């Protein structure tokens, strides 16, 4: 019938619109991107949006900071959507760690760091990931950990100085109380050098990306190990009986936050 046909068509247009917006986003245009994104039913398409943002950051970690700012803005209006992104990102990191997929560990962790910088996720997640990576330190595990600490370290220092202190103590034990190779010993000396210069090349949020008022953000406390449901089924088209109601419900939201 037409109800199915229209829901499917609207679903396909929604996926494409989101995909385009995610490809377009950068620092200079983030505000317009948000405005255009909000016009779309990103509640119905919360899985679609989460998937597009996660795939984009994975393929283009050079823009991680920008994806984090985008997520931060959306989360401030729709915390449940930011929570869905975080849950999947955490699971992605764990998949990578489990599969010894260093690239995915590098990009997923980089995303985590910037969602922490943006106060979308609680820093307990960073600390737990760093502890995991540093327990049985390998060349790859240390490389992920150090790249990760560079990105969230300044933030860590501010909200949890004792936590980051514990990480650095651990790194020093590895640097001396362990039998390590040149590669590990170099990456750690780099990390101490970065801490010494006060993370001068790794600011918490770049000028132009701190767009959510402190008190308007919703900081999710999501530990590393929890049995999160990624809800990937939300990515698949399905007929919605309350499609009418659900549609009119969203536009009521949209008119609210504009």
């Amino acid at each position: 019938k037409n109800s199915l046909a229209y829901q499917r068509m609207s679903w396909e247009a929604l996926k494409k619109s989101i995909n385009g917006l995610i490809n377009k986003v950068n620092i200079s245009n983030i505000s317009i991107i948000i405005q255009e994104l909000l016009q779309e039913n990103i509640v119905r398409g919360r899985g679609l949006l989460s998937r597009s943002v996660l795939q984009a950051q994975s393929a283009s970690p050079i823009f991680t900071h920008v994806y984090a700012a985008l997520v931060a803005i959306i989360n401030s209006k729709f915390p449940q959507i930011g929570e869905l992104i975080l849950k999947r990102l955490i699971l992605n990191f764990r998949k990578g760690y489990r599969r010894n997929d260093k690239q995915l560990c590098l990009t997923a962790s980089k995303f985590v760091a910037h969602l922490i910088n943006q106060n979308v996720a609680h820093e307990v997640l960073c600390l737990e990931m760093l502890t995991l990576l540093l327990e049985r330190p390998t060349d790859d595990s240390v490389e992920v950990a150090i790249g990760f600490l560079k990105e969230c370290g300044l933030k860590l220092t501010q909200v949890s100085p004792r936590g980051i202190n514990a990480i650095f103590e651990r790194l020093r034990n590895i640097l001396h109380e362990s039998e390590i190779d040149k590669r590990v010993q170099y990456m750690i000396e780099v990390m101490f050098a970065v801490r010494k210069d006060g993370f001068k090349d790794h600011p918490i949020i770049l000028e132009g990306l701190d767009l959510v008022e402190e008190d308007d953000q919703f900081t999710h406390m999501l530990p590393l190990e929890d049995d999160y449901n990624p809800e990937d089924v939300l990515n698949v088209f399905k007929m919605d009986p309350n499609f009418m109601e659900n549609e009119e419900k969203y536009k009521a939201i949209k008119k609210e936050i504009l």
């Binding site: 020093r172 034990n173 640097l175 001396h176 109380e177």
Partner: protein, 49 residues
């Protein structure tokens, strides 16, 4: 370098650990790290020729 040029039996007795821990106040682990580091450094510095 002048000792290994003269091929004398190179031994060493380094000094001032009271300057190391009563003045710079290191923990035991970092002090062991520093002493093993300077022993490995003078080992790699003697092992040139």
């Amino acid at each position: 370098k002048h000792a290994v040029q003269e091929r004398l039996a190179v031994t060493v007795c380094i000094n001032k650990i009271d300057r190391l821990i009563l003045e710079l106040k290191l923990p035991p682990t970092d002090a062991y790290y520093k002493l093993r580091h300077i022993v490995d450094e003078v080992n790699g510095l003697i092992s040139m020729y």
